[PDB]
Amino acid sequence: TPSYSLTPAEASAVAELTLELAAAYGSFGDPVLLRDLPRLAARLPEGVQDFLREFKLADRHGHTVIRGHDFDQRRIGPTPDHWRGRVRPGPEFPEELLLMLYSALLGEPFGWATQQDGHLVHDIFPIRSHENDQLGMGSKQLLTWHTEDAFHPYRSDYLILGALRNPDHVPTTVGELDLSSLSAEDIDVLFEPRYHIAPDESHLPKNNTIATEEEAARFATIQRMIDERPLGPLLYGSRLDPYMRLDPYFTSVPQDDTDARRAYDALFKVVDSGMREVVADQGDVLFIDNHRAVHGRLPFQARYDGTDRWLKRVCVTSDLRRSREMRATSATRLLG
Amino acid sequence: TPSYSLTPAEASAVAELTLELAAAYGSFGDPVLLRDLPRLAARLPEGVQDFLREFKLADRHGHTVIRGHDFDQRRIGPTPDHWRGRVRPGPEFPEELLLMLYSALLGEPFGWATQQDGHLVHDIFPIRSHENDQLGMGSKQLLTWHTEDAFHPYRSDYLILGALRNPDHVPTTVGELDLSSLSAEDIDVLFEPRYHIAPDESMIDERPLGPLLYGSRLDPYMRLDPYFTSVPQDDTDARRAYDALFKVVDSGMREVVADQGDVLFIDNHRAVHGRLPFQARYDGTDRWLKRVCVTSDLRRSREMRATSATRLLG
Numbered sequence A: 001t002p003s004y005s006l007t008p009a010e011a012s013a014v015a016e017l018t019l020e021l022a023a024a025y026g027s028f029g030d031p032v033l034l035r036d037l038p039r040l041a042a043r044l045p046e047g048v049q050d051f052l053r054e055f056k057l058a059d060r061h062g063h064t065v066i067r068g069h070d071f072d073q074r075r076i077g078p079t080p081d082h083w084r085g086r087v088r089p090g091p092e093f094p095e096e097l098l099l100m101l102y103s104a105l106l107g108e109p110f111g112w113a114t115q116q117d118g119h120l121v122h123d124i125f126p127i128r129s130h131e132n133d134q135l136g137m138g139s140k141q142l143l144t145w146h147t148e149d150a151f152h153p154y155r156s157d158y159l160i161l162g163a164l165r166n167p168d169h170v171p172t173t174v175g176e177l178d179l180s181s182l183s184a185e186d187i188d189v190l191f192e193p194r195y196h197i198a199p200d201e202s203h204l205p206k207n208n209t210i211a212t213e214e215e216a217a218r219f220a221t222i223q224r225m226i227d228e229r230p231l232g233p234l235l236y237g238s239r240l241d242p243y244m245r246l247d248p249y250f251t252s253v254p255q256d257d258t259d260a261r262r263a264y265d266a267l268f269k270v271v272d273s274g275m276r277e278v279v280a281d282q283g284d285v286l287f288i289d290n291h292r293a294v295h296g297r298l299p300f301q302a303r304y305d306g307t308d309r310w311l312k313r314v315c316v317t318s319d320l321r322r323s324r325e326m327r328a329t330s331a332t333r334l335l336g
Numbered sequence B: 001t002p003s004y005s006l007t008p009a010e011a012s013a014v015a016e017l018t019l020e021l022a023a024a025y026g027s028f029g030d031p032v033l034l035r036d037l038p039r040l041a042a043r044l045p046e047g048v049q050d051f052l053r054e055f056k057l058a059d060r061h062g063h064t065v066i067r068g069h070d071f072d073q074r075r076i077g078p079t080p081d082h083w084r085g086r087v088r089p090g091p092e093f094p095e096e097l098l099l100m101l102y103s104a105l106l107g108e109p110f111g112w113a114t115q116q117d118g119h120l121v122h123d124i125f126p127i128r129s130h131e132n133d134q135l136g137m138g139s140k141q142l143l144t145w146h147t148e149d150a151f152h153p154y155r156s157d158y159l160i161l162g163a164l165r166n167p168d169h170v171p172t173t174v175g176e177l178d179l180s181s182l183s184a185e186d187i188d189v190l191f192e193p194r195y196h197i198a199p200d201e202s203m204i205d206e207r208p209l210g211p212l213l214y215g216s217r218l219d220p221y222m223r224l225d226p227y228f229t230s231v232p233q234d235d236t237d238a239r240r241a242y243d244a245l246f247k248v249v250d251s252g253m254r255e256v257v258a259d260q261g262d263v264l265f266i267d268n269h270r271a272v273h274g275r276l277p278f279q280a281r282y283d284g285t286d287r288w289l290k291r292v293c294v295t296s297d298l299r300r301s302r303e304m305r306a307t308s309a310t311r312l313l314g
């Protein structure tokens, strides 16, 4: 698994660029910033650009990491108690800008209209009231591994996780598919439409408002997946180095499909066993290929005192226009 | 339709950039050129990058034009006799690199393994041999406008047409979808998978029925190729809605001339295009365009590509 370690010189250049842009641009509310992102990203050190371009085009490894960024702790400040009600942009705006630049080298940043107020850069930190929940803002509970939004046709192509702080070194579990561990007949079954991947509750049409004609048409395709329960493959792309979509919790193997349960169980075992602990420490940016890796996070104890683990997250789509039917306008990057 | 007209300073900077690039890299066969394309495209004039980015994100127009490029006719030399056996790269290499840079701003260049030797940059010029053929390469057409590879799930998202020369100002036909002249019921049936679009002659695959309009029902994208399109006889509503869509699209068609120095960008989701018939001289002074197809999501086509690294489908 290749990675890139910044020299102090590159770390200084990235930090300075990031402060400069933060000063020149208001917030992510400025549409000019979004327009400018790929041009701005070409101001990053070339070695960094070449590295991510190789990763993108290589289409072989499931994740990579850029380590050794300078994330100024004094400037960044305390890990917040909640994402809601914060002054925007925060003092950590330069770091958010950084992830956005990286997202533009990989594709287009996008988000979900009902998630964290539609923010393109998401927060990941413990919220006390959320501590008995299996979600990003949790802590005590294990977040079992998953492809992000496995059921969703317009799910992330990549995820970018940047760690502003991780004092106790809590790992992000990430897992890839070792194809040689699997029967070739098992592979054949996994490539076939035999599995049902259930849509997560937050993306449910009836989960949001049933108001008006168009706000209904925005969820018609997902509603159809719920209504019709099409079966789908778990593996796809090239038979020799397949993409995968695996979220064990939302996956049903039909009871009578004996070949499918044998094959799935084989796939589940292979991926579970291959799960790696990947610590995104302060100044690390983790890149996950959503078509080649699953990920999760191990339990941890929060202090709730402003010192807790704090990651930023950007989802990336290779083709913003594919999701048009789920977007309110052509300009919006938010699904729903 | 918004367009960008380059100052002489911009034209000179672009020309200089493409000559410098033409001398640094061997051909598109060099994998590092393909790697570097987006970084290299950031060396174009900022006004040009900004303009294309706006076109791409606005998702509002069927086409745009960047005009006033300096395409050095002496260096470029005579419009060739044929594409085959002709040596790559030719003296018009700077101009091909230019289209490749534009393609990296919009997405990723790709091609078809079987088309013109699988050259990432395609030639469009009158061939005496392939003359009175339907083919794009022959001097006739009618007005058989089309979405490019309308049948194909991995068809181009954009088409880039650079006019090296066009002495008799031969138009490209370009048409968008005017919704106002269509009923809501019709649009709804057009969104459903009730139509067949047959393949073209120029692995895997199936035989399904697909829709003609997709995306937003208020501002739809289209996959329309009238020639290869049929409707099950029994589906009278689908035939009705198809007839109305055809009439709306066919009647809104516009003639757009790609003059020397013009780069025409066609959004394959929002416009159909074609060519108009024209008398060719065949004397090396004929109209010559370069063409690059752009995919927004290269990885989506992985199953029809020989390797991870290849940009050629089929």
Ligand SMILES: O=C(O)CCC(=O)C(=O)O
Binding pocket: A124, A136, A143, A148, A161, A171, A172, A295, A296, A297, A311, A313
């Ligand atoms: O907290 C982490 O390391 C990752 C959480 C996660 O699963 C996500 O952001 O999708």
Ligand SMILES: O=C(O)CCC(=O)C(=O)O
Binding pocket: B124, B136, B148, B159, B171, B172, B173, B273, B274, B275, B289, B291
């Ligand atoms: O020559 C033209 O103007 C159009 C060419 C064309 O139809 C194509 O290459 O798709």
Ligand SMILES: [Fe+3]
Binding pocket: A146, A148, A295, A296
């Ligand atoms: Fe996740």
Ligand SMILES: [Fe+3]
Binding pocket: A149, A200, A202, A203
């Ligand atoms: Fe989700």
Ligand SMILES: [Fe+3]
Binding pocket: B136, B146, B148, B273, B274
């Ligand atoms: Fe065409």
